[PDB]
Amino acid sequence: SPIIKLRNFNNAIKYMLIDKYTKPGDVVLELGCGKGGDLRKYGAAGISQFIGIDISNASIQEAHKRYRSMRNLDYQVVLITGDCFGESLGVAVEPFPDCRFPCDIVSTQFCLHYAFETEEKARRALLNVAKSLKIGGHFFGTIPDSEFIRYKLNKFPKEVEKPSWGNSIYKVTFENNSYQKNDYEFTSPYGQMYTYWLEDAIDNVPEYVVPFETLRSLADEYGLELVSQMPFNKFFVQEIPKWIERFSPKMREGLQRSDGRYGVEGDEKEAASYFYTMFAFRKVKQYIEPESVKPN
Numbered sequence: 417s418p419i420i421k422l423r424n425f426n427n428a429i430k431y432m433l434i435d436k437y438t439k440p441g442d443v444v445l446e447l448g449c450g451k452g453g454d455l456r457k458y459g460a461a462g463i464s465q466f467i468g469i470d471i472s473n474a475s476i477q478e479a480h481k482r483y484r485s486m487r488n489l490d491y492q493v494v495l496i497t498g499d500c501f502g503e504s505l506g507v508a509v510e511p512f513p514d515c516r517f518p519c520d521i522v523s524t525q526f527c528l529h530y531a532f533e534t535e536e537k538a539r540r541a542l543l544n545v546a547k548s549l550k551i552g553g554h555f556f557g558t559i560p561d562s563e564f565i566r567y568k569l570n571k572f573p574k575e576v577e578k579p580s581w582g583n584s585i586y587k588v589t590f591e592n593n594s595y596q597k598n599d600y601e602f603t604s605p606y607g608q609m610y611t612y613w614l615e616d617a618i619d620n621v622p623e624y625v626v627p628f629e630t631l632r633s634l635a636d637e638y639g640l641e642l643v644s645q646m647p648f649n650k651f652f653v654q655e656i657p658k659w660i661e662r663f664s665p666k667m668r669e670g671l672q673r674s675d676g677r678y679g680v681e682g683d684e685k686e687a688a689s690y691f692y693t694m695f696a697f698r699k700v701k702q703y704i705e706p707e708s709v710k711p712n
């Protein structure tokens with residue numbers, strides 16, 4: 417693959433993130449789980465149950481096939497086709513009584529940007545996250561870094577009608593120039609759409625900016641406190657000392673620079689390590705909706 421070094425780096429990121437916060441015995445809710453490419457990371461963590469939900473039935477069927485082909489996974493897997501952002505999770509999980517809610521981890525890997533299509537969907541997504549967790553549980557994930565996106569948008573004069581940037585392996589094209597015309601601020605935290613292309617991975621699929629300050633403010637409203645937010649390059653630098661010995665020779669070699677350090681170079685530096693951030697929140701209190709508590 418032309419992006420093999422990017423894929424290796426981001427899979428290392430996800431190991432570092434998942435295994436930092438997930439504990440043996442945990443129940444994990446994986447929203448937008450895709451084809452199940454993170455099952456092995458949870459095996460290393462020693463979880464007890466994985467609940468994967470994705471709006472695509474085709475990806476769920478592939479996750480089923482992948483689970484059945486894997487050796488020495490000791491946890492129960494529940495896979496569900498359903499929308500995790502545009503509705504509450506209650507109907508989706510009804511046919512699956514084996515699910516052990518409340519859970520210990522909610523994970524959104526490369527998917528929460530789809531929930532930022534509108535305020536109502538961002539709020540529904542985060543309420544689903546908060547409701548599903550134990551106090552002390554964690555919500556973690558990987559999204560494009562809104563601060564890097566703003567850095568890039570700030571380079572364009574307001575006359576540029578469709579701000580676009582990239583390199584040999586990725587490209588971003590914004591729907592419009594409203595940000596620049598609005599004195600270099602988004603007109604709203606939600607619906608800020610761009611098309612995302614990554615060679616051999618994502619074929620011009622629209623997604624939405626996730627202004628991190630808005631994610632944090634909404635999370636706090638729903639009882640979740642920020643523990644960590646770090647661009648991929650800084651997170652990798654922080655965590656790699658713990659992981660070198662754990663990675664096999666082939667995994668290390670797929671991450672290694674010619675100067676002996678581990679990380680990305682060239683066009684993958686921006687596409688993988690600057691473009692994205694991780695995040696982790698902890699549930700600190702139970703959310704009760706305003707005006708929802710009624711007499712008798």
Ligand SMILES: Nc1nc2c(ncn2[C@@H]2O[C@H](COP(=O)(O)OP(=O)(O)OP(=O)(O)O)[C@@H](O)[C@H]2O)c(=O)[nH]1
Nearest residue numbers: 422423426451452453526527560612614617618623
């Ligand atoms: N901006 C953006 N990037 C994405 C999204 N989904 C995946 N990516 C990027 O595409 C890369 C490749 O993801 P995948 O195509 O699923 O490849 P993979 O990680 O090897 O997954 P598997 O083949 O299923 O094991 C990721 O590491 C991200 O950089 C998305 O929704 N938005």
Ligand SMILES: Nc1ncnc2c1ncn2[C@@H]1O[C@H](C[C@@H](N)CC[C@H](N)C(=O)O)[C@@H](O)[C@H]1O
Nearest residue numbers: 448449450470471472499500501525526527530
């Ligand atoms: N509203 C939604 N509800 C549930 N899943 C969704 C929704 N919108 C998009 N998705 C899924 O989100 C996934 C996005 C992928 N980029 C990420 C998959 C996987 N978590 C990974 O890390 O590779 C796809 O599998 C989509 O089908």
